[PDB]
Amino acid sequence: NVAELKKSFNRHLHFTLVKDRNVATTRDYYFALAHTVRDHLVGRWIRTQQHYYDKCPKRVYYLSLEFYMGRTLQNTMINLGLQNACDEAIYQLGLDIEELEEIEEDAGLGNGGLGRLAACFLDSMATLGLAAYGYGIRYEYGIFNQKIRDGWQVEEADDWLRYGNPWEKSRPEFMLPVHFYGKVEHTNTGTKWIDTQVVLALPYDTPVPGYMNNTVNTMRLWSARAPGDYIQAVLDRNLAENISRVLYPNDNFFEGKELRLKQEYFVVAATLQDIIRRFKAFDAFPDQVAIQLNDTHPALAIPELMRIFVDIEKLPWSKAWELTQKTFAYTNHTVLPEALERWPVDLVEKLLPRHLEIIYEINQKHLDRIVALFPKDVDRLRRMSLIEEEGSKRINMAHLCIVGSHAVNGVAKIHSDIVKTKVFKDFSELEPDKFQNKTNGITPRRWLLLCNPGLAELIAEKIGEDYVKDLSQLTKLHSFLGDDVFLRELAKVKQENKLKFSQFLETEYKVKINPSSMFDVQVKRIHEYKRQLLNCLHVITMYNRIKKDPKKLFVPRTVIIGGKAAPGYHMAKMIIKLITSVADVVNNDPMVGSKLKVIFLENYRVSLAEKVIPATDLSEQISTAGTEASGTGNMKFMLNGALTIGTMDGANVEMAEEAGEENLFIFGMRIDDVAALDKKGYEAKEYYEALPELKLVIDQIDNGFFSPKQPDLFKDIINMLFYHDRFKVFADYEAYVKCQDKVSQLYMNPKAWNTMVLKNIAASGKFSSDRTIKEYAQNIWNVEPS
Amino acid sequence: NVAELKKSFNRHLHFTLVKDRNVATTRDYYFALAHTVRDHLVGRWIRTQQHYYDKCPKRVYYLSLEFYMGRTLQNTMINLGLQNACDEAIYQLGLDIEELEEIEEDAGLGNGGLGRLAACFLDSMATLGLAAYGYGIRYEYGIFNQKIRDGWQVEEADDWLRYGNPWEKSRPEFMLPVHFYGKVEHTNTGTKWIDTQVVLALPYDTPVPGYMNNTVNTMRLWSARAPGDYIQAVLDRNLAENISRVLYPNDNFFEGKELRLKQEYFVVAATLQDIIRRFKAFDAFPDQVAIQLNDTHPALAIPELMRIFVDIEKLPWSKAWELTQKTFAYTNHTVLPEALERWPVDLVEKLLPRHLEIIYEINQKHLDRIVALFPKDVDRLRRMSLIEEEGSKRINMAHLCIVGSHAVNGVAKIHSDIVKTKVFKDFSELEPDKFQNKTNGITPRRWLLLCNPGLAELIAEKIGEDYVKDLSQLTKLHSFLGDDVFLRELAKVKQENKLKFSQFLETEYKVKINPSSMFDVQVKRIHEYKRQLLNCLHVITMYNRIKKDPKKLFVPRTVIIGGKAAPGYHMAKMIIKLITSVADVVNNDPMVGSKLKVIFLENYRVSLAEKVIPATDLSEQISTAGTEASGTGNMKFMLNGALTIGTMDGANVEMAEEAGEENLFIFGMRIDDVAALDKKGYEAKEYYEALPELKLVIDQIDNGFFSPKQPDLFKDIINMLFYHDRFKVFADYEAYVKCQDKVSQLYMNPKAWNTMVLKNIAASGKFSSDRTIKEYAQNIWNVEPS
Ligand SMILES: O=C(N[C@@H](Cc1ccccc1)C(=O)N1CC(C(=O)O)C1)c1cc2cc(Cl)ccc2[nH]1
Ligand SMILES: O=C(N[C@@H](Cc1ccccc1)C(=O)N1CC(C(=O)O)C1)c1cc2cc(Cl)ccc2[nH]1
Ligand SMILES: *Cc1c(COP(=O)(O)O)cnc(C)c1O
Ligand SMILES: *Cc1c(COP(=O)(O)O)cnc(C)c1O
Ligand SMILES: CC(=O)N[C@@H]1O[C@H](CO)[C@@H](O)[C@H](O)[C@H]1O
Ligand SMILES: CC(=O)N[C@@H]1O[C@H](CO)[C@@H](O)[C@H](O)[C@H]1O
C-alpha cells in the first residue's frame, strides 16, 4: 500500500541515491521512484523467464536495428497497476510525480514508425503472454535531439545514458565475440574463417511488462566492446566500440556506410549465437525458434544461421537451408527505391568474406531452380537473383530475405498487395502462400491509457475496461451515438488535453494559443513523400485568404507541424526552414491575430507524441498514394479523438473501411490516379496556372515574401516542385484545399464533429497491436497467446 | 549481525542483481555482498559531510593524478568492523568469501609508490577524523594488466569498469566545464580567455571510511565528457573523453605528451572550481582551504587559482598571490632528472595561453625580487626562474610549485635534505622555513590487519589492539625478546603465510616451491635505479655456485622478482626478459633442484602485494644510494615480518635508525661514496676483472648461456652495464653478494633470525601513515585530528 511505496522510496533515496530531503535533486527523486517501481518487476521477471525454460514453448525473436521505446516509468506503473498508488505515495511525500516523470530521457533508439512498431509489438507480445524476445543494439546515442536555430534544424547528441538507465540490466555472463574481416580458407576440414578481428558483444536486458498479466518479457540489446604506441593502442579501443555508438538517423533512406554494415552483422551474429546457445539447453530448432526480420536490416542473419549450421555444426547444406527457411520470416516496410538495401559485393567481401560465399551459394541453388522451371526465361533469372550485376555488383538484401524465409509480410493491405503482386511478382508467383499481410497496430496502453487518461476513463465509465485488452470492444461506443451528454463529455476531454498542451506550447514558444481554435497537426519524420510541403502550401493559402478578407467568418486554427529531418536530407531541411519562415510571417501579422497560428513542434519524439496527439482535432496523413506503407501515427490520432484528413494510402484505407469513408476526410489522387499521371507525364507548371491561389502561394515563396533577406532562399524547393517532384504536390493541392474547407465547415457544428469523432474512436479497435500480434503468432510464428 | 547480513545479501541478489541461487554467478554474489557492505557506509557518509558543513573546520585537499586504491570490499569490512560478521553470514549461505573477494578488480589508478601514498593518506586522514578530500581523475583504464609472453612483458588494457564499480557514486549536479586552447583578450573589464573548446568534468565520489571511528570521507575523481558529417561528429565526441581514458604508465619518467598536459589541467580546473564553489557556501579562503600538490603533476593549479582570483573574482594580483601561497603546499617525490616536469612554452601557449601569461607574470615578480636582493648575481636569476631559456624554452614546474606554495616537503630525511640544500639551494636560502621533511608511511589497516590477519592477531594477543591506531605501540613487542614460545609463534604465522602464497604460485606457475626455503622478494616497478639487475646478477651467481659444488650445505631460496615496466622503457623490458631467461635455466636445471627457484611475479599490483609481502622473509631494497626518495614497500615488508637487505637510501636509513643498523642488512655505497665514484669516473670494466664470480656471470649473459637461440640478445644490457650504467651496478655487486651470504648465515639460526625480525616489527611504529599525516596536519595544513 501507499505506506510501503513511501518507505521503499525513502529507502532508495537514502541507500541508492545517498541523499536526504534537504539535499536530494529532482533527478534523485525520479531515480528513487524508478527503483521503487523497478523492484516490483523482479519477481515476475524471474518467474516468466523461468517458466519459459520449464514448459519450453516455441520462442519468438524480434530482430530489429531499432526499438523506439520512449520513457519507461509510467508505462511500467500502469501495466503493473501501481500508478494510482504511486501517484498517491509521491503526493504524500510532497512531490509532483509529473515533475519526476519529466526527468526521464526517452530511449530513442529508433527513427520513427519502424522503431516504434517494434516497441508496440513488445508491449503486445508481453500482454498476450507470448515467449517473445526483442533483440537489438544498445546505442550509446539514439536519434539526435532537435533544436531550431535561425529557423533551421540543428542536431545535438542524444546522450541518453549520461546519468544512468535504471531499466537496463547488464548480463555479463552472456557476452560473446563477433568476427569481422579476415579471410576464407578452404581446407580438408572444411571452410574456415580465420585472421578475423574480434569485437565483444555485451547484452543488456530490459524488462517488458505485459498489461496486468504477470508476464515480464525481455528486450536484449547488444553493446560493442574491445577485446605501436601503448597510449594510442588503448585509445584505438574506441574504434571497436564505435559499432554501437550511434543510431543512423535515416528514415526511409539507404546509406551504404561500412559502419552501418558492421552494426547489422554485429547484432545479427551476437543474436544468433545467443539463440543457438539457448536452444542447446537441431531438427526441432524451427519448432522452438521463430526469428522475425524487421525489414532487410538484419538480412545477414540468414547466411549467418547457415554459416553456423554448416561451418560450425557440420550440418549438410540441404538440411541447414531447410531449417533456416522454417526459422526466418521477413517483414517488408517500404516501397521507395532509395530506401532499398543493396550492399556492394566489394564491401561485403572485405568485411564478411565467408558470408559473401554463402550468399553466392544461396543464389546459385536459387537460380538453378528457376531455370529448372523456366528453362528459357533468361531475363527472369537476373531479375530474381540476389545479385545485381549492373555496373558495380551489389546484393539485393530483400531478395536474400525472401528466399531465406518461409513467410514475407507487408504492413497494410494495399502495401502487402503491391509487394506481392508487383514488386516481387516473380517470387510470389513461384511461392504463392509465402507472401502475407499483417496490418500494423499500436498498443492501447501507451497510446490511450498512459497518454490520454481522460479518454480512457470516459470510455471505461461507459463500457467497462475490457476494451484495454480487446480494443474491438470499442465498437460498443456506438450505443452513445445520439447521447448528447456523452458527446459533450467527449469534447470536454479533448478540451482539457488542448488546454494542458497549450500551457506547454506557451512556455516553450512565445505564442499566444487560441484555446478554442482547431488543432491541425502533422507530426512525423520530415520527408517529401510525407508532404509537410503540401500542408505548408495550405497554411500559406489560409494566410492570404485572411489578408484579402479579414472580416470573413473564419474557423480559427492552430497548425502544428513537427518532425526531425535526416541530417543529410537537404530538401527536408529546406522544408523545415520554409515552415518556420511561414510561421513567423503568420504569427506576427497584425491582421491575422489569434485567427491562425503556426507552430513547428521541435524535437518530435515518443514522449512528445504522447502530449500533442491527445490534444489534436485534425490529423494530417497526406502522403502521396502508394508511398506510406502503413503509418501508425494515423492510428494513434484515430484512437485519441482526432478526425483524419488524408489520402487513400497505407492503413488510411483500412481506417476508412472500419469507420466508413464518409467519417474521414479522404481526398486527392489514389494509387491508380498516380499511375495514370505518371504514364502521361507530370507537369507541375500546369496546376501552377490553372490554380490561382497556388500561383500566389508559389510566387510569394519564390519572390521572397517569406525570406526577405534572401529572395532566392527557397529556389531549391521551387526548382524541385516544378521539375523534380516525384511526389506530385501540386496535383493534390486543389483537392487538398477543397477538403480542408469542408473540415472547417464541419468544425463549426460541434455536435456533428464530435459525432464523427465518436464513430472514429468506436472503429479504432482493429488497429490495436494486440490484434496484429495475434495474427503474426497464428499465421507466421505459429505460437499460442497464453 | 549475521541474520540481517544474510537477509540484506539475499535482498540485493534478488532486487539488485535479479538472480536466484540457482542462476547467480560468482560475480553476482560478490556484487550482492559489496552492496550489503556498501549500505553500512551511507549513514556515516552523509553524517560526516554534513558535519563538515556545520562546524566548518579547515579542509584538506589532496590533489593527485593518481590514487592506487586496490580493492575496496575487505578494507571497508575491516574499517567498519563487519568482516567477522560478514565472513560468517557468507559461510552460512554456503559461499566462500575469499572466492567472492577475488572477483573484485583493483582500482589501479596509479603507477606505484606515489599513487599508493595517496591511497594510504586517505585511509589515515579518515582514521584521524580530518576533513579531507582526495581529488583526482577517474581513468576508464588504469595501469595495464601485465602478462608474460615468451619471457617478455605484454600489456593488456585494464578495463576495470567493464562490469561496474559499486564503490563509486556519480555526482551529476556538480558537473563543470573545463576550457582548452582558445586565445586571450585584455579588455577594460578584465582579461578574457575566449574561443576555447569546452570539456565537461563529471565528478565520481568514493567513500573513504576511517578505521572504527564513524568517519567516512570522500575521494572525488573527475571523468571527461563531451558537451561536417553528423555520424562522424558524434564519434569525435570520443576525442574529448580521451582526456580521462587512460593513466600514463610511467614511474619516475617525464613524457611531454599533449594529452598528459590536458589531463593535468583538466583535474586542476575542475578541482579548483569545485573548491571555490564549496568555499562560497576570500580573505579567509586559506584558513578554510589547504591544497596539497602531489608532485608537480598538478602544478597548473597555482596559475589557475590566480586566474580565478584575478580574471573572475576581480581581486588585485598582490592579494591573490598572497592567498595562493597560503593555500598551496608542494611535495617533491623525485630526484632523477628524466622525471622532472618541464613543459615546452609552445605547447602550453597553444593549450593554456592565459596560464602562460600568468606564469610569465609570476616569474617576473619573482625574478625582480631576486635582483632586489642580489643585484649582480646574474647567473642566479636564470638559475631560479620558472623558465628554462636553453634551446627550446620550457617551464620548470618544480620552480612554479616552489614559489606558489608556502611549504615544500621531501618524503624522507635524506631526500628532503637533498631537495633543500642541493637541488633547491637557491630557494631554500631565501626561504629557510619553507622546506620541510615528512617521512612517508603506510596504513597499518590494509598493510597489516587486512593483508596479514595472522600477524595482527598474534600481536594483539600479546599487547592489545591499541597499536592499530597508534603503531608506535609496537615497541612493546620488545618485552618478548627472550620469549621462545612467542618467537616460535611468530615464525608459525610467517610459515602459514608462505604456505598459502605457495599454493598460489603453484597454480599460477608450474614450479614446485620448497615451502622451507627462504623467500627472497623484490617487488616494485621495474627501473634501472631500482636494480632488479643487481639482484639478477646475484641469482645467477648462486646458480653457478651450486653447479661448481652441488654438495655444499646451502640454505634453499625461492627468489621472487616482480613488477611492471613502463611500455616505452626498453631497458626495463630487457631486464624482465633477462630475469625470465635466468629463471628458466635455474628452475629446470636438474642439479639445482629444489635448492633454488626463481619466480617473476606477474602483474604485480596492490592486491597481489597484500599476498606476497606477508609471505616474505627477505626484502630487497637495493636502489643506488640517492635514487629512491623514500620507498614504502620497504616499510610494508618491515611491518610484516621480513628482514631487509639494502642500501642506506630513502627511508631505508630511518628504518635502520629505528630498528638499529645491526638489525638490517645494509651494504654497498652510501650517498657520499656515490659522489666520490662520480668525480673519479666510474669504469665498470674494472670490477668485471677484479671480481671473478662477476666475470662469469657477465660472460654467461653476453655469451648466450641464458639465450641460446639468440647469443647477442642481451648485448643491450652488457653495453649499458659496461659504458652507460648511471646506477653503478657492478660497484655494489661485491658488497651485495657479501651481504647476501651473511643473510643465509643468519637464516640457518631460526632463533636469531626471528629475534631480528621481532626487533624490526617492534620498531616499525614510525612508518604508519597516521604519524605522517599528523605531521602534515600540524606543520603544513594546520588542521586538527578529530
Ligand atoms: O552509484 C550508486 N548508485 C546508482 C543508482 C542508480 C542506478 C541506475 C540508474 C539510476 C541510479 C547511481 O547513482 N548511478 C548509476 C549511474 C551511473 O552509472 O552513472 C548513477 C551508488 C550508491 C552508493 C552508496 C555508497 Cl555508500 C557508495 C557509493 C555508491 N554508489
Ligand atoms: O543494472 C542493474 N543492477 C546493477 C547492480 C550493480 C550496480 C553497481 C555495481 C555493480 C552492480 C548492475 O547489474 N550493474 C551496474 C553495472 C553496469 O553499469 O554495467 C552492472 C539492474 C537491476 C534491475 C532490475 C530490473 Cl526489474 C530491471 C533492470 C535492472 N537493472
Ligand atoms: C508513431 C510515431 C511515428 C510514426 O509516424 P507516421 O506518421 O506513422 O510516420 C513517428 N514518430 C513517433 C515519435 C511516433 O510515436
Ligand atoms: C607500495 C607499493 C609500491 C611502492 O613500492 P616501492 O618498492 O616502495 O617502490 C608500488 N606498487 C605497489 C602495487 C605497491 O603496493
Ligand atoms: C523503412 C521504414 O522505416 N518503414 C516505415 O515502417 C513503418 C512500420 O511498418 C510503416 O508504418 C511506415 O509507413 C514506413 O515508412
Ligand atoms: C616519481 C615517483 O613516483 N616518486 C616516488 O614517490 C614515492 C612516494 O613519495 C617514493 O617513496 C619513491 O621513492 C619515489 O620514487
Side-chain angles (χ1 to χ4, degrees), chain A residues 374-400:
Chain A
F374 310 77
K376 298 178 188 57
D377 193 352
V378 302
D379 185 282
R380 181 163 183 170
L381 291 174
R382 43 130 259 180
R383 210 168 66 227
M384 291 188 79
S385 81
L386 324 185
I387 313 298
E388 292 176 45
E389 265 53 282
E390 299 70 62
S392 189
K393 287 178 169 49
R394 40 189 48 173
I395 304 169
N396 183 316
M397 306 318 286
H399 288 185
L400 172 58

Coordinates of all heavy atoms in Angstrom, one line a residue, chain A residues 374-400:
Chain A
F374 N 11.8 -22.6 -65.7 CA 11.6 -21.7 -66.8 C 12.9 -21.7 -67.6 O 13.5 -20.6 -67.7 CB 11.2 -20.3 -66.3 CG 10.1 -20.3 -65.3 CD1 10.3 -20.6 -64.0 CD2 8.8 -19.9 -65.7 CE1 9.3 -20.6 -63.1 CE2 7.8 -19.9 -64.8 CZ 8.0 -20.3 -63.4
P375 N 13.3 -22.8 -68.2 CA 14.5 -23.0 -69.0 C 14.9 -22.0 -70.0 O 16.1 -21.9 -70.4 CB 14.2 -24.4 -69.6 CG 13.4 -25.1 -68.6 CD 12.4 -24.0 -68.2
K376 N 14.0 -21.1 -70.4 CA 14.3 -20.1 -71.4 C 14.2 -18.7 -71.0 O 14.8 -17.8 -71.6 CB 13.5 -20.3 -72.7 CG 13.8 -21.7 -73.4 CD 12.9 -21.9 -74.6 CE 13.0 -23.3 -75.1 NZ 12.7 -24.3 -74.1
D377 N 13.4 -18.4 -70.0 CA 13.2 -17.0 -69.5 C 14.5 -16.5 -68.9 O 14.6 -16.5 -67.7 CB 12.0 -17.0 -68.5 CG 11.6 -15.6 -68.2 OD1 12.2 -14.6 -68.6 OD2 10.6 -15.4 -67.5
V378 N 15.4 -16.1 -69.8 CA 16.7 -15.5 -69.4 C 16.6 -14.3 -68.5 O 17.3 -14.2 -67.5 CB 17.5 -15.2 -70.6 CG1 17.7 -16.5 -71.5 CG2 16.9 -14.1 -71.5
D379 N 15.8 -13.3 -68.9 CA 15.7 -12.1 -68.1 C 15.1 -12.3 -66.7 O 15.2 -11.4 -65.9 CB 14.9 -11.0 -68.9 CG 14.9 -9.7 -68.2 OD1 14.1 -9.5 -67.3 OD2 15.7 -8.8 -68.6
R380 N 14.4 -13.4 -66.5 CA 13.8 -13.6 -65.2 C 14.8 -14.0 -64.2 O 14.7 -13.8 -63.0 CB 12.8 -14.8 -65.4 CG 12.0 -15.1 -64.1 CD 10.8 -15.9 -64.3 NE 10.0 -16.1 -63.1 CZ 8.8 -16.6 -63.0 NH1 8.2 -16.9 -64.1 NH2 8.2 -16.8 -61.8
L381 N 15.9 -14.7 -64.7 CA 17.0 -15.1 -63.8 C 17.6 -13.9 -63.1 O 17.6 -13.7 -61.9 CB 18.0 -15.8 -64.5 CG 17.7 -17.2 -65.0 CD1 18.8 -17.8 -65.9 CD2 17.4 -18.2 -63.8
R382 N 18.2 -13.0 -63.9 CA 18.9 -11.8 -63.4 C 17.9 -11.0 -62.6 O 18.2 -10.3 -61.6 CB 19.5 -11.0 -64.5 CG 18.6 -10.8 -65.7 CD 18.5 -9.4 -66.1 NE 17.2 -8.8 -65.7 CZ 16.9 -7.5 -65.9 NH1 17.7 -6.7 -66.6 NH2 15.7 -7.1 -65.5
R383 N 16.6 -11.0 -63.0 CA 15.6 -10.3 -62.3 C 15.3 -10.8 -60.9 O 14.7 -10.1 -60.1 CB 14.3 -10.3 -63.2 CG 13.4 -9.1 -63.1 CD 12.4 -9.1 -64.2 NE 11.4 -10.2 -64.1 CZ 11.1 -11.0 -65.1 NH1 11.6 -10.8 -66.3 NH2 10.2 -12.0 -64.9
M384 N 15.6 -12.1 -60.7 CA 15.3 -12.8 -59.5 C 16.5 -13.1 -58.6 O 16.4 -13.6 -57.5 CB 14.6 -14.1 -59.7 CG 13.2 -13.9 -60.2 SD 12.3 -15.5 -60.2 CE 11.8 -15.7 -58.5
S385 N 17.8 -12.9 -59.1 CA 19.0 -13.2 -58.3 C 19.2 -12.2 -57.2 O 18.8 -11.1 -57.3 CB 20.2 -13.3 -59.3 OG 20.7 -11.9 -59.5
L386 N 19.8 -12.7 -56.2 CA 20.1 -11.8 -55.0 C 21.2 -10.9 -55.4 O 21.6 -10.0 -54.6 CB 20.5 -12.7 -53.8 CG 19.9 -14.0 -53.6 CD1 20.4 -14.6 -52.3 CD2 18.4 -13.9 -53.6
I387 N 21.7 -11.0 -56.6 CA 22.8 -10.1 -57.1 C 22.5 -9.3 -58.3 O 22.0 -9.7 -59.3 CB 24.1 -11.0 -57.4 CG1 24.3 -12.0 -56.3 CG2 25.3 -10.1 -57.6 CD1 24.6 -11.4 -55.0
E388 N 22.8 -8.0 -58.1 CA 22.6 -7.0 -59.2 C 23.9 -6.8 -59.9 O 24.8 -6.1 -59.4 CB 22.1 -5.7 -58.6 CG 20.7 -5.8 -58.0 CD 20.2 -4.5 -57.3 OE1 20.4 -3.4 -57.9 OE2 19.7 -4.5 -56.2
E389 N 24.0 -7.4 -61.1 CA 25.3 -7.3 -61.9 C 25.5 -5.9 -62.5 O 26.6 -5.6 -62.9 CB 25.3 -8.4 -63.0 CG 26.0 -9.6 -62.6 CD 25.6 -10.3 -61.3 OE1 26.0 -9.8 -60.2 OE2 24.8 -11.3 -61.4
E390 N 24.5 -5.1 -62.6 CA 24.6 -3.8 -63.2 C 25.7 -3.0 -62.6 O 25.9 -2.9 -61.4 CB 23.3 -3.0 -63.0 CG 22.1 -3.6 -63.6 CD 21.6 -4.9 -62.9 OE1 21.2 -4.8 -61.8 OE2 21.7 -6.0 -63.6
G391 N 26.5 -2.3 -63.5 CA 27.6 -1.5 -63.0 C 28.5 -2.2 -61.9 O 29.1 -3.2 -62.2
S392 N 28.4 -1.6 -60.7 CA 29.2 -2.2 -59.6 C 28.2 -3.2 -58.9 O 27.2 -2.9 -58.4 CB 29.5 -1.1 -58.6 OG 30.4 -1.6 -57.6
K393 N 28.7 -4.5 -58.9 CA 27.9 -5.6 -58.3 C 27.5 -5.4 -56.9 O 28.3 -5.1 -56.0 CB 28.6 -6.9 -58.5 CG 28.7 -7.4 -59.9 CD 29.4 -8.7 -60.0 CE 29.2 -9.4 -61.4 NZ 29.4 -8.4 -62.5
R394 N 26.2 -5.5 -56.6 CA 25.7 -5.3 -55.3 C 24.6 -6.4 -54.9 O 24.1 -7.1 -55.8 CB 25.0 -3.9 -55.1 CG 24.2 -3.5 -56.3 CD 23.8 -2.0 -56.2 NE 24.9 -1.2 -55.8 CZ 24.9 0.1 -55.7 NH1 23.7 0.8 -56.1 NH2 25.9 0.8 -55.3
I395 N 24.4 -6.6 -53.6 CA 23.4 -7.6 -53.2 C 22.1 -7.0 -52.8 O 22.0 -6.0 -52.1 CB 24.0 -8.3 -51.9 CG1 25.4 -8.9 -52.2 CG2 23.0 -9.4 -51.5 CD1 26.1 -9.3 -50.9
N396 N 21.0 -7.6 -53.3 CA 19.7 -7.2 -53.1 C 19.2 -7.9 -51.8 O 18.8 -9.0 -51.9 CB 18.7 -7.5 -54.2 CG 17.3 -7.0 -54.0 OD1 16.8 -7.1 -52.9 ND2 16.7 -6.5 -55.0
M397 N 19.4 -7.2 -50.6 CA 19.1 -7.8 -49.3 C 17.6 -8.3 -49.3 O 17.3 -9.2 -48.5 CB 19.4 -6.9 -48.2 CG 20.8 -6.3 -48.2 SD 22.0 -7.6 -48.6 CE 22.1 -8.5 -47.1
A398 N 16.7 -7.6 -50.0 CA 15.3 -8.0 -50.0 C 15.2 -9.4 -50.5 O 14.5 -10.3 -50.0 CB 14.5 -7.0 -50.8
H399 N 15.9 -9.7 -51.7 CA 15.8 -11.0 -52.3 C 16.4 -12.0 -51.4 O 15.9 -13.2 -51.4 CB 16.5 -10.9 -53.7 CG 15.8 -10.2 -54.7 ND1 16.2 -10.1 -56.0 CD2 14.6 -9.4 -54.7 CE1 15.4 -9.4 -56.7 NE2 14.4 -9.0 -55.9
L400 N 17.5 -11.7 -50.7 CA 18.1 -12.6 -49.8 C 17.0 -13.0 -48.7 O 16.9 -14.1 -48.3 CB 19.3 -12.0 -49.1 CG 19.9 -12.9 -48.0 CD1 20.3 -14.2 -48.5 CD2 21.2 -12.1 -47.4

